[PDB]
C-alpha positions as semicolon CSV with decimal commas, in nm:
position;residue;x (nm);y (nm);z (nm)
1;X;0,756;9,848;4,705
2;X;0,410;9,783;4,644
3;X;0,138;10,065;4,779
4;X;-0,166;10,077;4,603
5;X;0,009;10,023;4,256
6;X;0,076;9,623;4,365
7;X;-0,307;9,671;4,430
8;X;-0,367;9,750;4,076
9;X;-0,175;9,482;3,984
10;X;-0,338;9,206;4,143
11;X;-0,679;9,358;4,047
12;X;-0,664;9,283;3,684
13;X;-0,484;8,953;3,824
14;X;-0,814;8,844;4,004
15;X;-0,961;8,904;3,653
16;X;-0,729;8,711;3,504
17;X;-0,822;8,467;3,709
18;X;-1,120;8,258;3,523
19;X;-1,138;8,553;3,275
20;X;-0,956;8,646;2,980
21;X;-1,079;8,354;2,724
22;X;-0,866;8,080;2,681
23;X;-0,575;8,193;2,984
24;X;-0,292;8,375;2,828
25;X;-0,243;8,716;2,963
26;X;-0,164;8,513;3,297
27;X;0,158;8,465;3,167
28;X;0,194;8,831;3,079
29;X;0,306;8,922;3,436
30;X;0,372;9,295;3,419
31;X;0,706;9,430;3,587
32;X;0,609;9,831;3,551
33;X;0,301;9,932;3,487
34;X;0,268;10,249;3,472
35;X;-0,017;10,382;3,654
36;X;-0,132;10,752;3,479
37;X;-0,295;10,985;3,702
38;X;-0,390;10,639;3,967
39;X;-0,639;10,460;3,773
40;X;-0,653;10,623;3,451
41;X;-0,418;10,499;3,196
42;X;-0,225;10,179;3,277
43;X;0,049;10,139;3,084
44;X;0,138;9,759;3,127
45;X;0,457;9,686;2,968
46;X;0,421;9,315;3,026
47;X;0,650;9,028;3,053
48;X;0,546;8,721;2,959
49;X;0,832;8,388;2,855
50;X;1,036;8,646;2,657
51;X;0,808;8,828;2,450
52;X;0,768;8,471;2,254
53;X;0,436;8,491;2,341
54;X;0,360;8,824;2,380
55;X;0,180;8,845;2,086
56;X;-0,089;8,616;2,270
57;X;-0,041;8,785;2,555
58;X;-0,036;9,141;2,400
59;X;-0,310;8,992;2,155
60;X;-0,499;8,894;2,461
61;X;-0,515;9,197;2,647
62;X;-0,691;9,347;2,345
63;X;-0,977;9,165;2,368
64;X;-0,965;9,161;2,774
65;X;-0,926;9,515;2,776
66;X;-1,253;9,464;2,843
67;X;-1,285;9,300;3,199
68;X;-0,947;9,535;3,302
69;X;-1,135;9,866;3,200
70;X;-1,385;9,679;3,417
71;X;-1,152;9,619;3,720
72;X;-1,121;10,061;3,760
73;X;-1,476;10,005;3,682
74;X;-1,556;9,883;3,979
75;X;-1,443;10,171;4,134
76;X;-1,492;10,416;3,927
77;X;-1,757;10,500;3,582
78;X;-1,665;10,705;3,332
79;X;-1,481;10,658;2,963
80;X;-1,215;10,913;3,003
81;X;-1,209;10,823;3,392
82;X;-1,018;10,427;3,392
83;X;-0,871;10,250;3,116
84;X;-0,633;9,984;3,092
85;X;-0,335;10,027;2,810
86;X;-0,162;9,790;2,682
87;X;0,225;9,799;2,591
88;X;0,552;9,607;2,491
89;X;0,813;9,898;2,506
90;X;0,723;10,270;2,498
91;X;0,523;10,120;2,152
92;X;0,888;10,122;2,038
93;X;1,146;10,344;2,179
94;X;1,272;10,537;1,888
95;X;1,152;10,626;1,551
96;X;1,176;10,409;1,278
């Protein structure tokens, strides 16, 4: 499958792509990504190495949640409109 969603996918790759300081997130490499509403919420689980480097990757994507929100940007305009989100696993799949 692909659709759109593989769209989405290689959008925020194109940003990757001489964005995101220092590359790192291009190892991420995303194998759900949720996609809320269609360009809302994007919940990237990401799957970089083995989640040895998530925390650069993860850590990354915080700072280039800037150019992603800007990838539904260029569609879209509005705060509660596009957003990238970042995750690792459902934040953590149980309680505590």
């Amino acid at each position: 499958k692909e659709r759109l969603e593989n769209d989405i996918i290689r959008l925020i790759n194109r940003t990757v792509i001489h964005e995101i300081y220092n590359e790192t997130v291009k190892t991420g490499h995303v194998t759900h990504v949720k996609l809320s509403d269609d360009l809302l919420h994007v919940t990237v689980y990401l799957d970089c190495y083995n989640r040895e480097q998530i925390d650069r990757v993860v850590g990354a994507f915080n700072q280039a949640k800037g150019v992603f929100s800007r990838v539904l940007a260029h569609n879209l305009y509005l705060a509660k409109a596009v957003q990238i989100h970042f995750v690792k696993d459902k934040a953590i799949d149980n309680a505590m």
